[PDB]
mmCIF file of all heavy atoms in Angstrom:
data_model
loop_
_atom_site.group_PDB
_atom_site.id
_atom_site.type_symbol
_atom_site.label_atom_id
_atom_site.label_comp_id
_atom_site.label_asym_id
_atom_site.label_seq_id
_atom_site.Cartn_x
_atom_site.Cartn_y
_atom_site.Cartn_z
ATOM 1 N N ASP A 87 98.057 120.528 120.513
ATOM 2 C CA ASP A 87 96.772 119.820 120.150
ATOM 3 C C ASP A 87 96.808 119.374 118.703
ATOM 4 O O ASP A 87 96.893 120.309 117.780
ATOM 5 C CB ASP A 87 95.633 120.830 120.448
ATOM 6 C CG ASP A 87 94.322 120.319 120.141
ATOM 7 O OD1 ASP A 87 94.081 119.144 119.689
ATOM 8 O OD2 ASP A 87 93.269 121.018 120.362
ATOM 9 N N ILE A 88 96.677 118.173 118.549
ATOM 10 C CA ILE A 88 96.727 117.493 117.054
ATOM 11 C C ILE A 88 95.547 117.546 116.249
ATOM 12 O O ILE A 88 95.482 117.098 115.192
ATOM 13 C CB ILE A 88 97.295 116.171 117.141
ATOM 14 C CG1 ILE A 88 96.392 115.146 117.851
ATOM 15 C CG2 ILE A 88 98.727 115.966 117.801
ATOM 16 C CD1 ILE A 88 96.704 113.624 117.714
ATOM 17 N N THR A 89 94.414 118.278 116.900
ATOM 18 C CA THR A 89 93.125 118.190 116.129
ATOM 19 C C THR A 89 93.114 118.582 114.773
ATOM 20 O O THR A 89 92.767 117.933 113.856
ATOM 21 C CB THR A 89 92.158 119.040 117.024
ATOM 22 O OG1 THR A 89 91.915 118.470 118.308
ATOM 23 C CG2 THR A 89 90.722 119.011 116.269
ATOM 24 N N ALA A 90 93.766 119.784 114.497
ATOM 25 C CA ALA A 90 93.843 120.384 113.147
ATOM 26 C C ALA A 90 94.631 119.412 112.159
ATOM 27 O O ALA A 90 94.223 119.336 110.999
ATOM 28 C CB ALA A 90 94.496 121.790 113.216
ATOM 29 N N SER A 91 95.685 118.864 112.716
ATOM 30 C CA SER A 91 96.576 117.976 111.755
ATOM 31 C C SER A 91 95.689 116.794 111.482
ATOM 32 O O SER A 91 95.772 116.339 110.283
ATOM 33 C CB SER A 91 97.765 117.490 112.586
ATOM 34 O OG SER A 91 98.807 118.550 112.508
ATOM 35 N N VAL A 92 94.996 116.187 112.404
ATOM 36 C CA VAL A 92 94.140 114.984 112.204
ATOM 37 C C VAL A 92 92.941 115.410 111.248
ATOM 38 O O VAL A 92 92.763 114.484 110.262
ATOM 39 C CB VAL A 92 93.600 114.437 113.577
ATOM 40 C CG1 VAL A 92 92.530 113.385 113.317
ATOM 41 C CG2 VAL A 92 94.660 113.860 114.369
ATOM 42 N N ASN A 93 92.314 116.501 111.409
ATOM 43 C CA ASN A 93 91.243 116.693 110.540
ATOM 44 C C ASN A 93 91.589 117.010 109.085
ATOM 45 O O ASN A 93 90.894 116.640 108.085
ATOM 46 C CB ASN A 93 90.511 117.927 111.008
ATOM 47 C CG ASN A 93 89.650 117.659 112.344
ATOM 48 O OD1 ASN A 93 89.440 116.546 112.623
ATOM 49 N ND2 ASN A 93 89.262 118.645 112.922
ATOM 50 N N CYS A 94 92.811 117.665 108.885
ATOM 51 C CA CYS A 94 93.377 117.903 107.564
ATOM 52 C C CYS A 94 93.726 116.595 106.906
ATOM 53 O O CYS A 94 93.521 116.239 105.661
ATOM 54 C CB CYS A 94 94.350 118.886 107.552
ATOM 55 S SG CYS A 94 95.149 119.315 105.863
ATOM 56 N N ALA A 95 94.412 115.676 107.604
ATOM 57 C CA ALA A 95 94.872 114.401 107.195
ATOM 58 C C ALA A 95 93.670 113.494 106.627
ATOM 59 O O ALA A 95 93.834 112.745 105.733
ATOM 60 C CB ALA A 95 95.669 113.538 108.243
ATOM 61 N N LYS A 96 92.552 113.652 107.290
ATOM 62 C CA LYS A 96 91.382 112.892 106.878
ATOM 63 C C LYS A 96 90.856 113.362 105.431
ATOM 64 O O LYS A 96 90.419 112.471 104.747
ATOM 65 C CB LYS A 96 90.263 113.105 107.868
ATOM 66 C CG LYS A 96 90.344 112.386 109.081
ATOM 67 C CD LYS A 96 89.347 112.831 110.141
ATOM 68 C CE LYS A 96 89.250 111.860 111.287
ATOM 69 N NZ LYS A 96 88.418 112.299 112.453
ATOM 70 N N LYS A 97 91.060 114.634 105.111
ATOM 71 C CA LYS A 97 90.726 115.175 103.755
ATOM 72 C C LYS A 97 91.868 114.601 102.722
ATOM 73 O O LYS A 97 91.450 114.308 101.665
ATOM 74 C CB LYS A 97 90.642 116.666 103.812
ATOM 75 C CG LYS A 97 89.609 117.081 104.636
ATOM 76 C CD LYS A 97 89.166 118.604 104.401
ATOM 77 C CE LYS A 97 88.516 118.856 103.066
ATOM 78 N NZ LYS A 97 87.939 120.181 102.940
ATOM 79 N N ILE A 98 93.041 114.562 103.170
ATOM 80 C CA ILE A 98 94.181 114.231 102.360
ATOM 81 C C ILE A 98 93.976 112.585 102.018
ATOM 82 O O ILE A 98 94.032 112.323 100.697
ATOM 83 C CB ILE A 98 95.575 114.319 102.981
ATOM 84 C CG1 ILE A 98 95.808 115.841 103.147
ATOM 85 C CG2 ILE A 98 96.658 113.721 101.984
ATOM 86 C CD1 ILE A 98 96.998 116.143 104.116
ATOM 87 N N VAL A 99 93.779 111.821 102.955
ATOM 88 C CA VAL A 99 93.624 110.359 102.799
ATOM 89 C C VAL A 99 92.494 109.902 101.975
ATOM 90 O O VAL A 99 92.422 108.948 101.420
ATOM 91 C CB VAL A 99 93.898 109.575 104.102
ATOM 92 C CG1 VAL A 99 92.559 109.647 104.839
ATOM 93 C CG2 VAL A 99 94.294 108.158 103.857
ATOM 94 N N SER A 100 91.417 110.836 101.911
ATOM 95 C CA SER A 100 90.245 110.569 101.205
ATOM 96 C C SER A 100 90.260 111.025 99.711
ATOM 97 O O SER A 100 89.294 110.812 98.991
ATOM 98 C CB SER A 100 89.038 111.199 101.910
ATOM 99 O OG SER A 100 88.813 110.924 103.274
ATOM 100 N N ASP A 101 91.300 111.736 99.280
ATOM 101 C CA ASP A 101 91.222 112.218 97.960
ATOM 102 C C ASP A 101 91.658 111.382 96.846
ATOM 103 O O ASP A 101 91.559 111.821 95.598
ATOM 104 C CB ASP A 101 92.228 113.625 97.922
ATOM 105 C CG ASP A 101 93.587 113.089 97.772
ATOM 106 O OD1 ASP A 101 94.004 111.997 97.587
ATOM 107 O OD2 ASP A 101 94.520 113.889 98.164
ATOM 108 N N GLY A 102 91.834 110.012 97.064
ATOM 109 C CA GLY A 102 92.045 109.074 96.025
ATOM 110 C C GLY A 102 93.327 108.245 96.150
ATOM 111 O O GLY A 102 93.299 107.149 95.612
ATOM 112 N N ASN A 103 94.348 108.900 96.598
ATOM 113 C CA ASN A 103 95.734 108.180 96.631
ATOM 114 C C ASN A 103 95.966 107.606 98.045
ATOM 115 O O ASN A 103 97.032 106.937 98.261
ATOM 116 C CB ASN A 103 96.775 109.265 96.405
ATOM 117 C CG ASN A 103 97.184 109.252 94.861
ATOM 118 O OD1 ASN A 103 98.383 109.204 94.479
ATOM 119 N ND2 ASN A 103 96.083 109.244 94.097
ATOM 120 N N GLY A 104 95.064 107.527 98.984
ATOM 121 C CA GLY A 104 95.241 106.935 100.445
ATOM 122 C C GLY A 104 96.518 107.488 101.034
ATOM 123 O O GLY A 104 96.780 108.725 100.960
ATOM 124 N N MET A 105 97.095 106.683 101.926
ATOM 125 C CA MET A 105 98.208 107.111 102.645
ATOM 126 C C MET A 105 99.572 107.235 101.799
ATOM 127 O O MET A 105 100.647 107.576 102.332
ATOM 128 C CB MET A 105 98.433 106.189 103.798
ATOM 129 C CG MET A 105 97.480 106.345 104.981
ATOM 130 S SD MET A 105 97.905 105.714 106.513
ATOM 131 C CE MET A 105 99.221 106.796 107.093
ATOM 132 N N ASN A 106 99.501 106.930 100.514
ATOM 133 C CA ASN A 106 100.623 107.268 99.611
ATOM 134 C C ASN A 106 101.094 108.600 99.421
ATOM 135 O O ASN A 106 102.113 108.904 98.799
ATOM 136 C CB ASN A 106 100.375 106.519 98.253
ATOM 137 C CG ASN A 106 100.176 104.971 98.331
ATOM 138 O OD1 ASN A 106 101.301 104.271 98.568
ATOM 139 N ND2 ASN A 106 99.080 104.482 98.011
ATOM 140 N N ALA A 107 100.089 109.499 99.773
ATOM 141 C CA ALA A 107 100.418 110.903 99.937
ATOM 142 C C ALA A 107 101.592 111.215 100.924
ATOM 143 O O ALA A 107 102.316 112.257 100.734
ATOM 144 C CB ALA A 107 99.181 111.591 100.350
ATOM 145 N N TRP A 108 101.858 110.267 101.786
ATOM 146 C CA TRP A 108 102.983 110.439 102.700
ATOM 147 C C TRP A 108 104.210 109.496 102.275
ATOM 148 O O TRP A 108 104.188 108.396 102.434
ATOM 149 C CB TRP A 108 102.563 110.102 104.201
ATOM 150 C CG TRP A 108 101.787 111.113 104.875
ATOM 151 C CD1 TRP A 108 102.201 112.321 105.348
ATOM 152 C CD2 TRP A 108 100.266 111.119 104.921
ATOM 153 N NE1 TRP A 108 101.058 113.043 105.811
ATOM 154 C CE2 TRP A 108 100.039 112.398 105.591
ATOM 155 C CE3 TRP A 108 99.337 110.395 104.523
ATOM 156 C CZ2 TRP A 108 98.618 112.636 105.752
ATOM 157 C CZ3 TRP A 108 97.978 110.686 104.739
ATOM 158 C CH2 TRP A 108 97.780 111.840 105.368
ATOM 159 N N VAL A 109 105.289 110.049 101.780
ATOM 160 C CA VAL A 109 106.441 109.471 101.195
ATOM 161 C C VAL A 109 107.062 108.323 102.224
ATOM 162 O O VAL A 109 107.452 107.313 101.952
ATOM 163 C CB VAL A 109 107.507 110.354 100.736
ATOM 164 C CG1 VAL A 109 108.739 109.713 100.243
ATOM 165 C CG2 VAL A 109 106.970 111.228 99.561
ATOM 166 N N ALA A 110 107.200 108.837 103.508
ATOM 167 C CA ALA A 110 107.856 108.068 104.582
ATOM 168 C C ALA A 110 107.016 106.819 104.927
ATOM 169 O O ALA A 110 107.555 105.733 105.212
ATOM 170 C CB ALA A 110 108.086 108.862 105.858
ATOM 171 N N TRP A 111 105.689 106.955 104.853
ATOM 172 C CA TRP A 111 104.743 105.813 105.039
ATOM 173 C C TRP A 111 104.927 104.792 104.002
ATOM 174 O O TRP A 111 105.052 103.560 104.125
ATOM 175 C CB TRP A 111 103.271 106.281 105.079
ATOM 176 C CG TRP A 111 102.341 105.047 105.234
ATOM 177 C CD1 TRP A 111 102.086 104.450 106.341
ATOM 178 C CD2 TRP A 111 101.721 104.418 104.151
ATOM 179 N NE1 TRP A 111 101.232 103.368 106.142
ATOM 180 C CE2 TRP A 111 100.988 103.305 104.759
ATOM 181 C CE3 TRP A 111 101.710 104.440 102.766
ATOM 182 C CZ2 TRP A 111 100.204 102.443 104.064
ATOM 183 C CZ3 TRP A 111 100.842 103.659 102.035
ATOM 184 C CH2 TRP A 111 100.241 102.665 102.550
ATOM 185 N N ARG A 112 104.964 105.363 102.603
ATOM 186 C CA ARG A 112 105.116 104.448 101.446
ATOM 187 C C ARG A 112 106.474 103.688 101.598
ATOM 188 O O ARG A 112 106.431 102.428 101.267
ATOM 189 C CB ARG A 112 105.077 105.287 100.215
ATOM 190 C CG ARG A 112 104.863 104.419 99.015
ATOM 191 C CD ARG A 112 104.705 105.359 97.704
ATOM 192 N NE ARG A 112 105.742 106.221 97.256
ATOM 193 C CZ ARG A 112 105.776 107.550 97.518
ATOM 194 N NH1 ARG A 112 104.914 108.207 98.018
ATOM 195 N NH2 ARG A 112 106.985 108.027 97.088
ATOM 196 N N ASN A 113 107.581 104.351 102.021
ATOM 197 C CA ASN A 113 108.852 103.754 101.849
ATOM 198 C C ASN A 113 109.201 102.962 103.214
ATOM 199 O O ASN A 113 110.086 102.153 103.132
ATOM 200 C CB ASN A 113 109.982 104.828 101.687
ATOM 201 C CG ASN A 113 109.790 105.366 100.219
ATOM 202 O OD1 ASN A 113 109.365 104.731 99.351
ATOM 203 N ND2 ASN A 113 110.279 106.624 100.122
ATOM 204 N N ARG A 114 108.704 103.249 104.411
ATOM 205 C CA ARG A 114 109.070 102.678 105.651
ATOM 206 C C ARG A 114 108.102 102.046 106.422
ATOM 207 O O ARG A 114 108.355 101.333 107.424
ATOM 208 C CB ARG A 114 109.795 103.773 106.495
ATOM 209 C CG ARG A 114 110.833 104.655 105.640
ATOM 210 C CD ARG A 114 111.518 105.673 106.504
ATOM 211 N NE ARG A 114 112.409 105.128 107.438
ATOM 212 C CZ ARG A 114 113.226 105.761 108.400
ATOM 213 N NH1 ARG A 114 113.252 107.232 108.261
ATOM 214 N NH2 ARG A 114 114.066 105.231 109.127
#
Side-chain angles (χ1 to χ4, degrees):
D87 180 358
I88 65 169
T89 304
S91 287
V92 170
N93 290 347
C94 183
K96 286 173 170 166
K97 299 194 74 166
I98 296 169
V99 76
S100 303
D101 76 14
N103 270 226
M105 287 196 72
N106 293 295
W108 288 277
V109 175
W111 178 83
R112 195 169 69 252
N113 293 332
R114 314 182 69 176

